[PDB]
């Protein structure tokens, strides 16, 4: 009985491995040794968003590629007019520990989350000329590592209870819960069509989930330590994972196995944040050694380094229009590179 | 610059001065982390926050494998409590204090130690119904290393054990770090009245260490 399921689970797992191998027709590197190399990209700091006094832990661009919300351990959420360095708002927070911050696509709300296991939603565009708390979502057991708005009434959160949840903001209730990860989910990314989302976890496994049904469609296991960052390719049919084992890897949803690994001999520190570019050829990863590396997504060769921070890069966001990259570190500065 | 951008800049400048004023008031307070075990009396010395002001200095202490340690890398000191009376789980407590001591981020972070259930410990070994050597026999020796204790002599040979259990938390302590961070053993009960002064005096010592290190007198 119990033993019978043990061999069945293993034997069915082997059929997974054999099915994965049959799809390994050729290496991604094998067919891509014909495109012109990107060369070396030289990115320079264009702004320094001074004003934060603690370690910046997250940032999020608005859909307009103009406003961005930044989160730091001083308990302040600041919206920046990055064009003019102006501070649009400054939201005090009830809890000073923020691990994630999100910008609503509409622009009327911001989400904050962290060690309080609560996703707080703030109304920006409202009367009285001040920002007020709209909802306080409660129900997770572990800390929120990420949260992403779907619309003005739905938000998907990732937590340290090995689960992800989908909320109805007006009701404040968990519409859907996502279970199956063994480790701590540390990152989250919504697909462009907001019907599926990936969630890399601490068990060296990444999973595709279905928002509508709530079932884990796929599971990817190629890493050896915590997966810290995860992000969809602009296609939506692949995602990249930056892990604490000092390696980026570009998993494929349909092929259901790893394509390309980004690792170098002299790099030993882990990976904190990962964000693609508009076209997906560039895979920018923020590292623990105070700078972020612009890996070539299809070539796995370092195309550059952004050494402008004197502490480790915590967040790494890229504009929706591709015009800028904003990096925040423990140095309490956001740098906008171009 | 526009009429509205000048007005917007004036708004940004006002936000700046409130940010600096709020940040300045946030500099006269000390972050304390609290860890330990379940049956340990964490609150007897999703995130709870307590703020006690000792000698006009604010100490805002916090209650919550541990991925979020990266948050607590600017903490003045991490308070750790281990179960002196609870015997057959101490080797778990050693392992927990081992990882906290050699963690990537808590390399310069000091630890205060607050051995708990001290009153229960005295009557635990007096009865004699608990062989520590069977838990772990380092006591086989029972050296009673020369020491001075304010407290009375042990009727059952209890006091050497009072410094016997304690010192395992000062051997892992002095194995890595090269003096960057310091552990401070202490013994406490649940009715030990003034116990916040111990953190205050220990936080006082740590500020010297960074102060002396910058001036390079240490």
């Amino acid at each position, epitope marked *: 009985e119990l033993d019978q399921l043990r061999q069945e689970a293993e034997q069915l797992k082997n059929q997974i491995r054999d099915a994965r191998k049959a799809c390994a027709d050729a290496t991604l590197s094998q067919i891509t040794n014909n495109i012109d190399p990107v060369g070396r990209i030289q990115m320079r700091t264009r702004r320094t968003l001074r004003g934060h006094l603690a370690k910046i832990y997250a940032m999020h661009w608005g859909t307009d590629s103009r406003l961005l919300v930044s989160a730091s351990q001083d308990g302040k959420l600041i919206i920046w007019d990055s064009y003019t360095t102006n501070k649009v708002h400054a939201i005090p927070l009830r809890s000073s520990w923020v691990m994630t911050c999100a910008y609503a696509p509409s622009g009327n709300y911001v989400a904050c989350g962290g060690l309080d296991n609560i996703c707080s939603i703030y109304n920006l565009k409202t009367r009285e000329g001040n920002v007020r708390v709209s909802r306080e979502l409660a129900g997770h057991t572990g800390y929120l590592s990420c949260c992403r708005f779907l619309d003005d009434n739905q938000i998907v959160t990732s937590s340290g209870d090995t689960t992800c949840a989908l909320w109805d903001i007006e009701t404040g209730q968990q519409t859907t819960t996502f279970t199956g990860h063994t480790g701590d989910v540390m990152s989250l990314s919504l697909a462009p069509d907001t019907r599926l989302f990936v969630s890399g976890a601490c068990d060296a496994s990444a999973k595709l989930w279905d928002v509508r049904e709530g079932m884990c469609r796929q599971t990817f296991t190629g890493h050896e330590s915590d997966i810290n960052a995860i992000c969809f390719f602009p296609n939506g049919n692949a995602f990249a994972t930056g892990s604490d084992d000092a390696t980026c890897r570009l998993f494929d949803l349909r092929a259901d196995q790893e394509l390309m690994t980004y690792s170098h001999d002299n790099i030993i520190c882990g990976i904190t944040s990962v964000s693609f570019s508009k076209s997906g050829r560039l895979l920018l990863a923020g590292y623990d050694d105070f700078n972020c590396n612009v890996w070539d997504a299809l070539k796995a060769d370092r195309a550059g380094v952004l050494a402008g921070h004197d502490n480790r890069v915590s967040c790494l966001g890229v504009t929706d229009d591709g015009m800028a990259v904003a990096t925040g570190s423990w140095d309490s500065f956001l740098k906008i590179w171009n | 610059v526009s009429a*509205e951008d000048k007005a917007a800049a*004036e*708004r940004s400048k006002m936000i700046d001065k409130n940010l600096r004023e709020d940040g300045e008031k946030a500099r006269r307070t000390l972050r304390l982390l609290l860890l330990g075990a379940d049956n340990s009396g964490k609150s007897t010395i999703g995130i709870f926050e307590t703020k006690f002001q000792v000698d006009k200095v604010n100490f805002h202490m916090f209650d919550v494998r541990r991925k979020w340690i990266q948050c607590f890398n600017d903490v003045t000191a991490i308070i750790f409590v281990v179960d002196s009376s609870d015997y057959n789980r101490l080797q778990e407590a050693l392992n927990d204090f081992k990882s906290i001591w050699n963690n990537r981020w808590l390399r310069t972070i000091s630890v205060i130690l607050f051995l708990n259930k001290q009153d229960l410990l005295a009557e635990k070994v007096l009865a004699g119904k608990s062989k520590i050597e069977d838990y772990f026999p380092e006591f086989a020796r029972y050296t009673t290393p020369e020491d001075a204790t304010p407290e009375p002599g042990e009727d059952p040979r209890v006091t050497r054990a009072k410094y016997f259990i304690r010192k395992e938390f000062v051997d892992i302590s002095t194995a890595s770090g090269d003096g960057r961070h310091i552990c401070y053993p202490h013994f406490t009960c649940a009715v030990d009245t003034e116990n916040a002064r111990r953190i205050f005096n220990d936080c006082k010592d740590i500020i010297l260490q960074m102060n002396l290190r910058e001036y390079n007198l240490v």
Partner: single-chain antibody
Framework: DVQLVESGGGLVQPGGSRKLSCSAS????????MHWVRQAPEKGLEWVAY????????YYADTVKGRFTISRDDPKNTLFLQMTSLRSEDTAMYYC??????????????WGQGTTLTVSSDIVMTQATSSVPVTPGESVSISCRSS???????????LYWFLQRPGQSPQLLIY???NLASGVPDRFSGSGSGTAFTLTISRLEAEDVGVYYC?????????FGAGTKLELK
């Protein structure tokens, strides 16, 4: 719940002094720039003074620069207009207006009531259509033309459209040509370019009769429109 109530005023002999007071209730008054605007008995809206948030920037109109004082008390949630050496040309009803200034804001959004006061270089607006009758249910378009290109290099155009209903305070319809305000029907719209701006009122309805004004914001002084009227028949 936003409410600006004006008081003071009345009958004053020439040469005297009078102080107006506006009390704010229902919003973060400390975070709003505030304006004083007069209304002559048979004329248009006219700027008087402006005080910034924090009282760090004050602008008075050249017409009353020197004998007018503007001040505010944020803890008291009130702002004052100290008038001295009142003139026979100062007979007007004074409104108090709130304006906030950041990226994406809508200044001049709320207007208060009016206080009557009876006493015994710059851009110029052109509201050429003094009064044009329009049948209900149709569409009417208003044209504005200033004497300067109202587009700044930051991409921000500058005209705020206002609607003054009979027996009511002016209200804000559009801020910066192509931006609807809060609580405004979608039929109102605005477009155009420098010195050539138009507002369209598609599907004219009841409770829409009033005099329309045109204000610039690229440089103080805050010169307003002469007034475009719409009436029934």
């Amino acid at each position: 719940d936003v409410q600006l109530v004006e008081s003071g005023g009345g009958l004053v002999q020439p040469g005297g002094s009078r102080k107006l007071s506006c009390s704010a209730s229902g919003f973060a008054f400390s975070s709003f720039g505030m304006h004083w605007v007069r209304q002559a008995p048979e004329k248009g809206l006219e700027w008087v003074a402006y005080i910034s948030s924090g009282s760090g920037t004050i602008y008075y109109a050249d017409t009353v620069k020197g004998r007018f004082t503007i001040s505010r008390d944020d803890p008291k949630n009130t702002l004052f207009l100290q008038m001295t050496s009142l003139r026979s040309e100062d007979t007007a009803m004074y409104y108090c207006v709130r304006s906030i200034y950041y990226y994406g804001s809508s200044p001049f959004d709320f207007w208060g009531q009016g206080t009557t006061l009876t006493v015994s270089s710059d851009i110029v607006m052109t509201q050429a259509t003094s009064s044009v009758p329009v049948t209900p249910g149709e569409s009417v378009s208003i044209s504005c033309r200033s004497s300067k290109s109202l587009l700044h290099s930051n991409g921000n155009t500058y005209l705020y459209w206002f609607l003054q209903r009979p027996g009511q305070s002016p209200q804000l319809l559009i801020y910066r040509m192509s931006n609807l305000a809060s609580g405004v029907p979608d039929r109102f719209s605005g477009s155009g370019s420098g010195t050539a701006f138009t507002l369209t009122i598609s599907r004219l309805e009841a409770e829409d009769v009033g005099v329309y004004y045109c204000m610039q914001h690229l440089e103080y002084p805050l010169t307003f429109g002469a007034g475009t009227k719409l009436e029934l028949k």
